[PDB]
Amino acid sequence: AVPTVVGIPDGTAVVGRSFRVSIPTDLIASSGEIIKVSAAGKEALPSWLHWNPHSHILEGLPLDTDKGVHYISVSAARLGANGSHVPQTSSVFSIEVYPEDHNEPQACAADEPVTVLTVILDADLTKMTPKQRIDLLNRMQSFSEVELHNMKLVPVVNNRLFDMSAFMAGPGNAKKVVENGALLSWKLGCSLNQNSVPDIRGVETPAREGAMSAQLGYPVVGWHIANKKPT
């Protein structure tokens, strides 16, 4: 009698940046009902998302191939005496994945380069689940002193494991690079130079000694600091 309708607001995401939203399951599910979260019209989520049923958190880390709008269905079903799932309600919202974070947490002055620290990892993000992508970011926090949601994680492109414009850099623990590679990066400041970069020993030393890779779960190829043209 008199069903309730819950609207969930649409969200936004950016390639290479962590995504996290709470879903109001206590409003959608009358006691006893089973919640399902999927891509609308499918049983699975999009490949970049992960649903935590006990925390009610939908989270993910999109790749360039996830650009665009994703409709997500949150549905509640009654479990019948015979084991059937009787759907009761469905609430659908969308998430638009945008292509570029412009190296900004979300800023430097216009046309002022952003100083970015990048760690190059022997990893293939397309082989990793969303949870694995997020946990790699989580594991980097000890070293970056940047929160999960302000780091960036994207694949290597054109097989380039270096940045020749970098004015500081150093080695990791890896001797071979087996996978395509991943770039895990964050902002240090605006238009910095060697003399104004913060203390980076807490990156460079564990990178070279192998303590960083032991904590991240992936081999570290190297790191570098470079000023990136603004976008």
Numbering used by the authors: 58 to 163, 179 to 303
What text comes from the article?
The conformation assumed by Asn109 allows for the establishment of H-bonds with Lys203, Glu116 and His107. In addition, the H-bond network involving Asn109, Glu116 and Lys203 in D109N abolishes the interaction between Lys203 and Glu116 observed in the WT structure. In details, the mutations Asp109→Asn and Thr190→Met led to a significant increase in the maximum dimensions (with Dmax increased from 90 ± 3Å for WT to 95 ± 3Å and to 100 ± 3Å for D109N and T190M respectively) and in the Rg values (from 25.20 ± 0.04Å for the WT to 26.40 ± 0.04Å and to 27.20 ± 0.04Å for D109N and T190M, respectively), suggesting a more extended shape of the two pathological mutants compared to the WT protein.
Dystroglycan (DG), a ubiquitous membrane receptor belonging to the glycoprotein complex associated to dystrophin, plays a crucial role in the stability of the plasma membrane, especially in skeletal muscle tissues where it is highly expressed. The molecular structure of the N-terminal region of α-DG (α-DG-Nt) was later determined at high resolution by X-ray crystallography, revealing the presence of two domains, an immunoglobulin-like (Ig-like) domain and a domain similar to the small subunit ribosomal protein S6 of T. termophilus (S6 domain), connected by a flexible loop. Noteworthy, it has been shown that α-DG-Nt is necessary for recruiting LARGE and some pathological conditions that are caused by missense mutations in the DAG1 map within the α-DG-Nt.
